[PDB]
Every structure is written in C-alpha cells, then in structure tokens.
Amino acid sequence: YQVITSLLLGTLIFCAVLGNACVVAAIALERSLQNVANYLIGSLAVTDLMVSVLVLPMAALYQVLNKWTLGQVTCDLFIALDVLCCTSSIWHLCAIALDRYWAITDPIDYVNKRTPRRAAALISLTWLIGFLISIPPMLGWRTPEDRSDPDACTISKDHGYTIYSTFGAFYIPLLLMLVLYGRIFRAARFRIRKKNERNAEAKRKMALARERKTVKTLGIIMGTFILCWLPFFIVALVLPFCESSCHMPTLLGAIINWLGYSNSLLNPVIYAYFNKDFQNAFKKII
Amino acid sequence: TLSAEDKAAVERSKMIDRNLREDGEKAAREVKLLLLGAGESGKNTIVKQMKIIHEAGTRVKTTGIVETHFTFKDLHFKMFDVGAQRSERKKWIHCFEGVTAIIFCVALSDYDLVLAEDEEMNRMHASMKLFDSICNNKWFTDTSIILFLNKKDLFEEKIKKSPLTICYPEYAGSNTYEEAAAYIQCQFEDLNKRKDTKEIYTHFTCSTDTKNVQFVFDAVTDVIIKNNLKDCGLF
Amino acid sequence: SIAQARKLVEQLKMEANIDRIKVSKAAADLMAYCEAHAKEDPLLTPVPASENPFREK
Amino acid sequence: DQLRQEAEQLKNQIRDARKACADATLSQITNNIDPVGRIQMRTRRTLRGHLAKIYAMHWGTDSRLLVSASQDGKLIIWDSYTTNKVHAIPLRSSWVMTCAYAPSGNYVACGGLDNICSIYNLKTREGNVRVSRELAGHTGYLSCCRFLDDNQIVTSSGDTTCALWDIETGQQTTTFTGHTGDVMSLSLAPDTRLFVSGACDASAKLWDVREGMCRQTFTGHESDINAICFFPNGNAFATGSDDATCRLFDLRADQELMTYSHDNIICGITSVSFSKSGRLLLAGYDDFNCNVWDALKADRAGVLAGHDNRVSCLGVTDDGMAVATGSWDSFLKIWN
Ligand SMILES: C/C=C\C/C=C\C/C=C/C/C=C/CCCC(=O)O[C@H](COC(=O)CCCCCCCCCCCCC)COP(=O)(O)O[C@H]1[C@H](O)[C@@H](O)[C@H](OP(=O)(O)O)[C@@H](O)[C@H]1O
Ligand SMILES: CC(C)CCC[C@@H](C)[C@H]1CC[C@H]2[C@@H]3CC=C4C[C@@H](OC(=O)CCC(=O)O)CC[C@]4(C)[C@H]3CC[C@]12C
Ligand SMILES: CC(C)CCC[C@@H](C)[C@H]1CC[C@H]2[C@@H]3CC=C4C[C@@H](OC(=O)CCC(=O)O)CC[C@]4(C)[C@H]3CC[C@]12C
Ligand SMILES: COc1ccc2[nH]cc(CCN(C)C)c2c1
Numbered sequence: 001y002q003v004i005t006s007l008l009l010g011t012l013i014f015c016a017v018l019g020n021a022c023v024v025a026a027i028a029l030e031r032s033l034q035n036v037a038n039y040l041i042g043s044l045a046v047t048d049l050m051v052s053v054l055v056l057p058m059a060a061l062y063q064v065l066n067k068w069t070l071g072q073v074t075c076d077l078f079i080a081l082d083v084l085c086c087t088s089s090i091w092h093l094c095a096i097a098l099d100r101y102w103a104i105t106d107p108i109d110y111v112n113k114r115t116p117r118r119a120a121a122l123i124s125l126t127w128l129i130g131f132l133i134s135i136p137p138m139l140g141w142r143t144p145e146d147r148s149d150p151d152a153c154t155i156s157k158d159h160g161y162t163i164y165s166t167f168g169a170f171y172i173p174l175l176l177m178l179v180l181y182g183r184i185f186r187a188a189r190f191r192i193r194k195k196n197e198r199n200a201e202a203k204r205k206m207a208l209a210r211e212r213k214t215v216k217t218l219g220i221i222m223g224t225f226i227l228c229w230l231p232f233f234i235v236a237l238v239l240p241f242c243e244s245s246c247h248m249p250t251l252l253g254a255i256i257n258w259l260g261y262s263n264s265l266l267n268p269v270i271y272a273y274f275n276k277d278f279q280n281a282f283k284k285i286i
Numbered sequence: 287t288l289s290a291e292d293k294a295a296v297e298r299s300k301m302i303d304r305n306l307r308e309d310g311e312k313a314a315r316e317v318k319l320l321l322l323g324a325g326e327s328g329k330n331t332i333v334k335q336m337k338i339i340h341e342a343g344t345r346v347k348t349t350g351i352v353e354t355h356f357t358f359k360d361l362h363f364k365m366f367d368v369g370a371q372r373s374e375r376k377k378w379i380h381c382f383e384g385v386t387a388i389i390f391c392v393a394l395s396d397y398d399l400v401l402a403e404d405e406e407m408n409r410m411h412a413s414m415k416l417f418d419s420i421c422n423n424k425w426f427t428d429t430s431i432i433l434f435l436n437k438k439d440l441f442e443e444k445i446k447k448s449p450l451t452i453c454y455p456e457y458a459g460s461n462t463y464e465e466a467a468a469y470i471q472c473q474f475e476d477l478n479k480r481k482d483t484k485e486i487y488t489h490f491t492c493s494t495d496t497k498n499v500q501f502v503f504d505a506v507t508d509v510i511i512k513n514n515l516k517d518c519g520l521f
Numbered sequence: 522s523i524a525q526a527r528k529l530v531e532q533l534k535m536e537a538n539i540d541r542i543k544v545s546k547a548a549a550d551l552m553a554y555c556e557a558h559a560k561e562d563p564l565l566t567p568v569p570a571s572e573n574p575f576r577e578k
Numbered sequence: 579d580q581l582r583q584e585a586e587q588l589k590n591q592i593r594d595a596r597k598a599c600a601d602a603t604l605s606q607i608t609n610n611i612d613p614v615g616r617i618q619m620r621t622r623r624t625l626r627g628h629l630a631k632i633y634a635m636h637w638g639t640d641s642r643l644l645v646s647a648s649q650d651g652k653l654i655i656w657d658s659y660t661t662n663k664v665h666a667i668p669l670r671s672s673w674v675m676t677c678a679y680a681p682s683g684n685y686v687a688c689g690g691l692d693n694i695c696s697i698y699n700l701k702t703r704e705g706n707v708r709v710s711r712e713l714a715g716h717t718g719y720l721s722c723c724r725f726l727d728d729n730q731i732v733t734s735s736g737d738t739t740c741a742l743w744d745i746e747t748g749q750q751t752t753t754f755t756g757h758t759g760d761v762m763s764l765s766l767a768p769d770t771r772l773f774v775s776g777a778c779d780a781s782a783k784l785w786d787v788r789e790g791m792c793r794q795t796f797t798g799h800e801s802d803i804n805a806i807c808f809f810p811n812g813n814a815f816a817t818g819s820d821d822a823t824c825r826l827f828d829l830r831a832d833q834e835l836m837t838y839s840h841d842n843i844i845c846g847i848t849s850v851s852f853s854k855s856g857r858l859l860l861a862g863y864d865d866f867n868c869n870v871w872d873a874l875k876a877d878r879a880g881v882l883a884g885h886d887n888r889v890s891c892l893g894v895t896d897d898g899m900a901v902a903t904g905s906w907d908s909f910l911k912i913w914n
Contacts, residue, residue, distance in 0.1 A: 031886075031907070031908075032886075037517070100514075100518050103514040103517075103518075104511060104514045104515055104518065104520075105511075107507045107510040107511050107514070108359070108360050108361055108507070110510060110514060111315060111317065111361060111362075111510065112315050112360065112361070112362075115311075184518075184520065185520075187511070187515075188515050188520040188521060191508070191511060191512060191515060191521065192521070196472065199475075199476070202481060206481070206482060210521055213519070213520070213521070214515075214519075214520040214521065217518070217519045217520055218520070274519065275517070275519065284886075292660070295657070295660065295662045295664075296660075296662060298662065298663070298664070299657075299661070299662035299663045299664075302627075302654075302663040302665075302666045303627050303663060305666065306627050306629070306650075306652060306654075306663075306666055309650070309652070309668070310629040310650060313629075313650065313651075345670070345712070346694060346712045346714045347714075348671065348692040348693055348694050348714070349693060349717070350691050350692040350693035350694070350716075350718075350719060351671065351673055351691040351692050353671075366673075368691070371691065371718070371719060371736075372717070372718065373718045373719060373736035373737070373760050374736065374759065374760050374778055374802075377719075377736065377760055377762065377778065377802070378675070378691060378719055378736075381633075381649065381673060381675070381691065523579050523581070526579060526581035526582070526585070527581065529581075529585060530581050530584055530585050530588065532756065532792060533585060533588035533589065533592070534588055535791075536592060536792070536793075536794060536795060537588055537591055537592045537595065539793065539794065539832065541595060541596070541599045541830070541831065541832050542599065542830045542831060543599055543601050543602075543831075544599055544600045544601060544602060544603075544604075544828070544831045544833065544835070545601050545602035545607060547813070547814075547828045547830050547831040547835070548602065548604045548607040548608070548828075548831075548835060549607060550811070550813070551604070551809070551811065551813075551814060551828070551835070551856070551874070552607060552608055552611060552874055554809075554810070554811045554855075554856060555855055555856055555857040555873070555874055556611075558810070558854065558855035558856070558857075559855050559857060561854060561855065561898065562853050562854045562855035562857060562858070562898050563854070563897075563898050563899050563900075563914075564617070564619070564853045564854070564858055564860075564894070564898060564899075564900075564901065564914075565614060565617075565853060565855060565857050565858060567618075568899075573899070573914065574642075574659055574899060575622040575623060575658070575659070575899065575900050575912055575914045576622055576914065
C-alpha cells in the first residue's frame with residue numbers, strides 16, 4: 001500500500017537529486033563547461049537540486065502519510081520553499097530561452113556584449129521573481145481557513161494571491177517562453193531555408209533533416225514544460241475560484257503536483273543530458 | 287605562508303592573473319579569420335579593399351605572418367595572412383584551429399596561366415589542390431570557408447580571347463562570363479567533402495568599396511548564428 | 522645545380538672521415554653513466570616528502 | 579651531373595662503417611640491468627592562467643622558475659614552488675611556437691610564425707620586463723631557440739637552417755645549413771660546444787657551434803622529427819617524431835641505439851626530455867598523455883596521464899626534482 005508509493009517517490013527523489021548533482025559537479029569540475037549558457041543550465045540544475053533536497057522529501061512524506069505531521073511552522077516553510085524553488089526553476093527555463101534567443105538572433109551581442117555577469121543577473125532575476133511569489137503569503141494574503149485545519153498543508157487560496165502567483169509563476173513565463181521559442185523557430189527556419197542535380201537533392205535532404213531536428217527539439221522543450229506544469233497551474237487557478245461543484249479527486253491532484261515536481265527531474269535530461277559537451281564531460285568523468 | 291615576501295608574491299600573482307583575465311576577455315571579442323591563397327591569387331587586393339576606411343580597429347618587419355585588424359559594424363575582425371610562410375603547411379596549420387572562418391582567395395584569370403615551377407601545371411589546378419587540402423583538414427572540420435574569386439574582369443576578357451577548355455578538359459558549354467564563372471564556382475564547391483558540418487560562401491570580388499567586407503561580415507554572422515543554433519540543437 | 526652536388530659530396534666525405542667506436546663500448550658507457558647517477562635521480566627513486574620541494578615545504 | 583654516383587657510394591660506405599661498428603645491440607648490453615619498475619607520478623602543481631593552447635615551456639637553471647608560451651600572446655614566468663606568476667610578458671605576435679629561459683636567469687626568448695626571435699630582459703633597473711632585442715633573418719617560422727649563454731642564442735627555423743645569434747649586435751654569427759626540410763627542434767650540449775637539430779626531412783644533424791659545420795647526420799626516422807634532447811652525458815640524444823616512435827642516437831657510435839615504440843601508440847611525439855641520470859626518457863604524445871620510457875631497456879615505465887589535450891611541451895628540472903608538461907588545454911602540470 002503506502003510502501004509502494006513511498007518507494008516510488010523515494011526513487012524519483014533519488015533520481016532527481018542524482019541528476020542535478022551530476023550536472024552541477026560536471027559544470028564545476030570542467031573548464032570547457034564554463035560559458036554563459038552552461039552557467040544558466042548549471043544554475044537551473046542547482047535550483048532543481050534545491051527543489052529535490054528541500055521540497056521533494058517533505059512533499060513525499062506528506063503524500064505517503066496523507067496528513068501533515070511536521071507542525072504549522074514547518075508546513076508554512078515547506079509551502080514557502082515549494083513556491084520559491086519551483087517558480088525559480090520555471091523562470092530559469094525562461095532565462096535559458098531568453099539567452100538562446102539573444103545568442104541566435106543577435107550575433108553581435110553574442111560576440112561583444114555576452115559576459116557571465118549577464119548569466120548572474122538573469123539567475124538573480126529568476127530568484128527575485130521566486131521570492132516575490134513565495135513571500136507575499138508570509139505577511140498578509142493568508143486567510144484563517146489555511147490554519148483552520150492543523151492536519152493539512154495547502155497553498156493560500158485567496159483569489160487575489162491565486163491570480164498573482166499563478167500568473168507570475170507560470171503564465172507570464174509560459175507566454176514569454178512561447179514567444180521567445182517561436183522567434184527562435186522563425187530564425188532557425190530562415191537560416192535553414194537559405195552533378196548539379198545530385199548536389200541540389202543532397203541540399204534539400206539536409207535542409208529537411210535540419211527542419212525535422214529543430215521542430216523535434218522545440219517540441220521536446222515546449223512539450224515537457226507544458227505537459228508537466230500546465231496541468232498544475234490550470235487546476236491551481238480554477239479550483240480556488242470554484243469553491244463548490246468542482247470536487248478534486250485526490251489521485252488526480254497528487255499526480256498533477258508530482259508531474260510538476262518531476263519537471264525538475266526532466267530539466268537536466270533535456271537541458272544537460274542531451275547536448276554533446278555535457279555527454280563528453282560525463283564520459284571524461286566516468 | 288604569512289611572510290611579507292610571500293604575501294607580496296601572492297599579491298603580484300593575483301594582479302597578473304587579473305590582467306590576464308582582462309586581456310583574455312578583450313581577445314575573445316575579436317573574430318579571427320585565416321586568409322589563404324596561391325601566390326598572386328589577389329589576396330593583397332582583398333586586404334587593401336578591407337583596409338580602405340577601417341584600420342587597426344623600433345619594431346622589426348617580420349615577413350612571416352601579417353596582421354590585419356579591421357572593424358566592421360561593431361564587430362572586431364583579425365585577418366591572418368600566411369602567404370609569405372614558405373614552408374610545410376601541416377607543421378603550423380593547427381595553430382589556426384578555432385578561427386571563425388577561412389577566407390580563401392583564388393584568381394579566376396589564372397586558368398590560362400601556369401605555375402613558374404613547371405609549365406605542365408595549371409595555376410587553377412594548384413589553387414584547387416590547395417583548396418581541397420585546406421578544406422578537408424582534420425583541424426577545419428567545422429570551420430566554414432569564405433571563397434573569393436578575384437579578377438572577374440580579366441577572366442571575362444581572357445575567356446573572350448581564349449577558351450576555358452584548356453583549364454577544364456571535361457567542361458562543355460558556350461563561353462561567356464556567367465556560365466564559366468558558375469562552372470568554376472561549382473568545381474570549387476564540389477571539393478568540399480564535409481557538406482554536413484561546413485558551408486562555403488562564394489563571392490566574386492568587385493571594385494565596390496564595401497561589398498567584399500560586407501559579404502565577409504554576413505558570412506561571419508551567419509556562421510556565428512548557425513553555431514549558436516547547433517549548440518541549442520536546432521541545426 | 523652542380524655546386525650543391527659538390528657541397529653535398531664534400532659533406533658526405535667529411536662525415537665518412539670521422540672516427541667511430543664500437544656500439545658495445547658506447548652502450549656500456551651509457552649504462553655506466555645511468556648507474557653512476559641513479560642515486561641522484563629524484564624521478565627514478567621517489568624522494569621522501571621531507572626534502573621534496575613540490576609537496577612539503 | 580655524375581656526382582650522384584660518388585654521393586651514393588659515400589652513403590653506402592657510411593652505412594657499411596656503421597654496420598661494422600654495430601657488434602652488440604643496446605638491449606643485449608642492458609638486459610642484465612634490472613627494470614626501473616613502475617613509475618608513479620602525481621600532479622603536484624597545476625599552473626593555471628593561460629587562455630589558449632600552450633606550445634613551449636622551459637625550466638630555469640635554479641629549477642624553480644619556468645617560462646611558458648601560449649597562443650594567447652602571453653609569456654608567463656611561473657614559480658613552480660608556489661604557483662605564483664612572477665611575470666606575464668605580452669607578446670607583440672600571438673603566434674609563438676617556442677620559448678627559452680636564459681641560464682643566467684636574466685633573459686627570456688620566444689618566437690613563432692613571425693620569423694623573429696624576441697629576447698626579453700627580465701631583471702632590469704625598473705622592474706618592468708621589456709624586449710631587449712628582436713633577432714630577424716630567418717625566412718621561415720622559428721621553431722626552437724636555446725640560450726647558448728647570456729649573450730648568444732641558437733635558433734632553428736622552418737627555412738631548413740639553424741642560426742647562431744649574437745644578441746648584442748643582433749646578427750647571425752654563424753648559420754648551419756644542410757637540412758632538407760623544416761627544422762622542428764634543437765638541443766644544446768651540457769658543455770654548449772655542440773647542438774643537434776631534428777628536422778622534417780626525417781633526419782637529425784650534429785652541429786659544431788664554433789666551426790658551424792655538420793659533424794654527423796642521423797637518419798633513422800620514417801617521418802618528420804618534432805623533438806630532440808641531449809642525454810645528460812652529452813654523448814647521446816633522443817628524437818621524437820610523428821612516426822609514433824622515439825629513437826636514441828649515440829654521437830661516438832654514430833648510429834641508432836634503441837627504438838622506444840609500442841603497438842598501442844599511433845600518435846606522434848611532440849616533446850622529449852631526459853631525467854637527471856638519463857635513465858628515464860619522458861616523451862609527450864598527441865595521445866594527450868606523456869609516456870615515461872626507461873632509456874636503457876626501452877620499457878614503458880610510467881604514464882603521466884591527466885592532460886585534457888595534446889601535450890605540446892615537456893621539460894625536466896636541472897636538479898631532476900620534477901618534470902613539467904604543458905599541453906594544448908592551457909594548463910602546465912608539474913609531476914615530481
Ligand atoms: C510519429 C513520428 C515521430 C515521433 C516518433 C518518434 C521519435 C521521437 C520521439 C519523442 C522523443 C523522445 C525523446 C528522444 C530523446 C533523444 O533522441 O535523445 C538523443 C539520444 O540521447 C540519448 O539517448 C541519451 C539520453 C541520456 C539521458 C540521461 C540518462 C539518465 C536519465 C535520468 C537522469 C537522472 C539520473 C542521472 C539525444 O538528443 P537528440 O537526438 O534528441 O537531439 C537534440 C535534442 O533534441 C535537443 O533537445 C538537444 O538540445 P538542448 O536540449 O536544447 O540542449 C540537442 O543537443 C540534441 O541532443
Ligand atoms: C510524464 C511526462 C511529463 C514525461 C515527459 C514527456 C515528454 C518528453 C514528451 C511529451 C510530448 C512529447 C512530444 C510529442 C510530439 C513530438 C513531435 C515529434 O515529431 C515532430 O517533430 C512533428 C511535430 C509536428 O508535426 O508538429 C517529435 C517528438 C515530439 C516533439 C515529442 C517529444 C517528447 C515529448 C515532449
Ligand atoms: C516524468 C517522469 C520522470 C515520470 C514521472 C512519474 C510521476 C509523475 C509519478 C511516479 C510515481 C507516482 C505516484 C505513485 C503513487 C501515488 C499515490 C496516489 O495515492 C493517492 O493519494 C490517491 C489514491 C488513494 O486515495 O489511495 C496519488 C498519486 C501518487 C502520489 C503518484 C503521483 C505521480 C507519480 C509521482
Ligand atoms: C497558487 O499555487 C501556486 C502558485 C505558484 C506556485 N509555484 C510553485 C508551486 C507549487 C509547485 N508544486 C506544488 C508542484 C505553486 C503553487
């Protein structure tokens with residue numbers, strides 16, 4: 001019963017922390033992996049590591065016990081670290097998208113005005129939005145209904161806070177990242193589009209292969225982000241406004257929460273375990 | 287450890303390391319291009335063409351390697367001419383591994399001409415052999431080549447007076463500038479075995495002041511953008 | 522290119538006119554030098570860290 | 579003309595004399611010598627600060643300071659004891675392929691694709707390093723330079739010629755012609771009266787510094803020679819070529835003694851050097867690692883693995899304490 005779900009959450013937690021730690025270590029100990037893009041990917045891995053060692057464990061204990069057994073203060077801190085680290089991870093994805101968009105569409109900026117200070121500013125900005133989404137439920141915007149049930153731990157369901165958090169944590173990042181990756185798609189397609197018959201056929205085949213590759217890569221990125229977080233932030237917006245007639249099954253809600261938690265496990269798989277430079281570094285470490 | 291001499295030495299090392307970091311940051315903002323070609327292939331004309339307006343952003347003349355530092359549209363370029371390095375190329379060609387692009391200049395008008403070393407060797411064939419050797423080096427697997435075909439007017443006059451079949455026996459077509467210039471360009475393109483990792487940006491050198499350096503800038507920006515797309519996995 | 526041929530043949534004759542010793546004697550001298558200085562070769566015999574300047578002051 | 583006949587006759591006579599002098603292979607003589615055993619070396623210091631592929635280094639005569647040259651146009655005087663950067667000379671030409679550190683410790687030389695051997699004055703009256711002299715006259719890339727003394731320097735360049743320079747006047751006191759291909763290495767004698775050069779014609783020549791004439795020619799390699807180093811005795815030297823094989827030539831025997839080859843090695847040697855006693859021949863390789871060779875027995879004693887890229891330079895201190903290997907990944911490593 002509870003043993004199976006506890007084991008599944010534990011192995012998920014272990015895989016997430018192992019992957020994030022491996023990515024951070026590979027970036028730290030390798031001198032080739034010390035550029036602005038790899039710094040952003042490493043900061044994303046650090047944020048996901050904080051998600052896996054500061055949020056995942058306490059969320060798993062809450063899930064298997066089906067009750068909060070740590071106290072009101074420990075529940076409040078867990079919620080604060082649940083919103084701060086996960087919102088930071090989402091904005092790290094958005095910051096990586098912004099860096100890629102700047103690198104692809106502005107080569108002059110890439111050559112001249114691209115420094116690790118930009119990477120540090122973006123990371124600080126992603127943690128800043130994290131703090132401004134996680135702190136407001138600390139002081140104010142906390143209905144007494146949250147504390148009315150000591151044997152539960154739920155995010156403040158005030159309508160104003162619900163709108164503010166859900167937008168500034170997922171929907172502003174979801175529109176921003178969609179726009180940036182659409183522009184990147186347009187740039188990549190424009191670059192790809194621009195005996196003699198054999199060479200023309202080879203060029204056509206290679207261009208088609210590149211178009212397939214770019215559409216696949218964008219599909220992987222946007223699909224994972226959407227299939228993990230969108231299910232959670234649609235419910236996290238509809239449920240608070242619909243107090244009644246919108247009963248939420250426990251199974252579906254738990255699957256949805258852990259789908260978003262698993263977005264932190266899937267981030268190193270996409271942004272780190274797929275490119276060639278990390279694969280070579282890991283082979284050199286092995 | 288904490289001695290005054292050791293503290294001074296560590297402070298000197300830290301200051302030196304800061305200066306090295308600053309110099310490396312400054313040097314990473316410069317696009318490095320390697321200019322190659324055979325003798326009077328018209329690379330001097332190219333260098334002169336790019337240094338008409340923008341230049342340099344008891345010393346002894348070296349005659350070994352030539353530095354050309356020019357800035358075009360907020361981009362710093364550094365062109366390394368090794369035409370005066372009359373020695374084995376493979377013993378120093380790896381020193382230029384990692385340049386953004388290779389500017390390779392061949393004169394279209396030397397198809398009729400032959401090398402001074404021996405009459406039975408066309409200058410265009412020597413240039414083609416050099417292009418094949420430099421395009422397929424293990425150092426330049428991913429390095430794109432900016433191909434310049436200089437002396438279009440002299441080539442047009444020569445093909446008006448002399449047929450092109452002497453340089454290319456297998457060639458077959460009515461002799462005029464456009465088709466012959468396209469055939470030579472395609473022959474130079476076909477020497478690129480690495481069609482999947484590198485591209486060749488062929489331009490016909492023109493007397494216009496800005497068009498040549500503009501083409502070099504466009505090729506370099508298109509190389510940088512494609513490298514950034516390949517890094518993201520989108521190319 | 523005839524003068525270079527004369528220079529080359531003169532160089533070859535001068536090289537051939539030098540005195541040579543048996544390879545066994547030269548190898549024995551090399552083996553004697555190696556064994557005579559084997560005590561003062563820190564790379565050959567690892568030196569204790571007390572007097573090793575790159576590990577312990 | 580007909581001089582080819584007597585030229586090949588002289589070549590055959592030289593070969594016959596060398597074969598006659600060969601009575602016992604160096605393996606037979608050193609078979610009784612016990613193996614040196616496994617050589618375990620651990621990176622003690624890792625000097626960091628270069629930002630491009632190192633191409634040369636040279637230890638000082640005090641065995642503590644060393645100079646390194648790299649493509650970032652920087653000539654750093656390290657302090658291997660404390661990793662401190664004593665000096666960082668900005669090169670006028672970033673294409674540097676060689677460097678040397680004067681025996682007196684006052685001067686440092688470098689050169690490269692620019693056919694100029696720049697000489698820097700480290701110890702001056704203001705504490706600021708400045709180019710003392712620039713030696714021009716080579717028509718090819720200058721591949722190696724070694725300080726004969728504080729006033730004379732020997733340079734080998736890719737114009738098939740080695741030159742002896744008078745630093746005070748800046749002119750070639752003597753030029754050493756005879757090589758057919760690009761001269762890629764040069765090693766000075768312990769008494770500095772002789773020096774050999776390994777060139778791209780797959781041959782090495784022993785030169786007299788004073789008379790400026792080739793005393794001997796050693797043709798054993800099948801490809802161009804990239805490195806050369808005199809055995810501590812001064813009567814022998816080792817050569818490293820793209821044949822993936824190192825070779826030991828004796829001056830008095832005027833012939834090859836030993837071949838340091840392995841079937842697992844197919845990459846060319848980029849740098850060789852001997853230990854203080856001459857019993858270990860440390861050779862850098864394009865396999866990213868340096869292999870320690872027991873000179874007398876031709877056995878692969880140790881492996882100085884650790885470098886992320888090809889090992890370009892390599893040197894052993896004068897007191898024999900430590901071996902430092904620079905590599906294309908912009909890191910010097912002192913091994914000990
Ligand atoms: C119907 C028609 C068509 C559709 C049908 C079928 C075809 C497609 C199906 C859908 C795709 C599913 C996933 C495919 C993944 C895949 O093919 O991966 C390839 C193989 O690598 C491994 O196997 C190596 C994987 C190693 C992963 C880590 C291992 C450990 C995991 C746990 C981690 C935690 C513990 C360590 C590698 O990647 P790739 O071939 O997909 O191509 C690119 C990738 O898409 C780009 O995203 C990536 O860019 P970046 O992410 O932006 O940096 C590129 O660098 C490049 O990798
Ligand atoms: C439990 C979940 C959260 C685990 C993670 C699953 C993702 C890695 C999946 C979900 C949707 C998948 C995508 C769905 C469809 C496609 C299109 C497919 O073919 C195309 O490129 C055609 C695209 C088009 O026609 O629009 C390539 C794989 C890709 C991007 C898939 C990549 C893998 C994705 C992102
Ligand atoms: C993207 C890749 C890494 C796959 C990610 C899979 C996870 C989203 C899965 C794996 C294990 C799943 C869990 C396995 C078992 C349970 C118990 C289950 O029990 C209940 O509380 C509801 C039923 C009941 O009341 O008993 C709720 C869902 C949950 C937490 C699941 C949530 C979704 C999890 C974390
Ligand atoms: C309104 O509920 C919110 C608002 C913003 C948020 N950021 C991260 C979370 C929680 C993430 N795990 C529950 C998956 C969150 C919830």
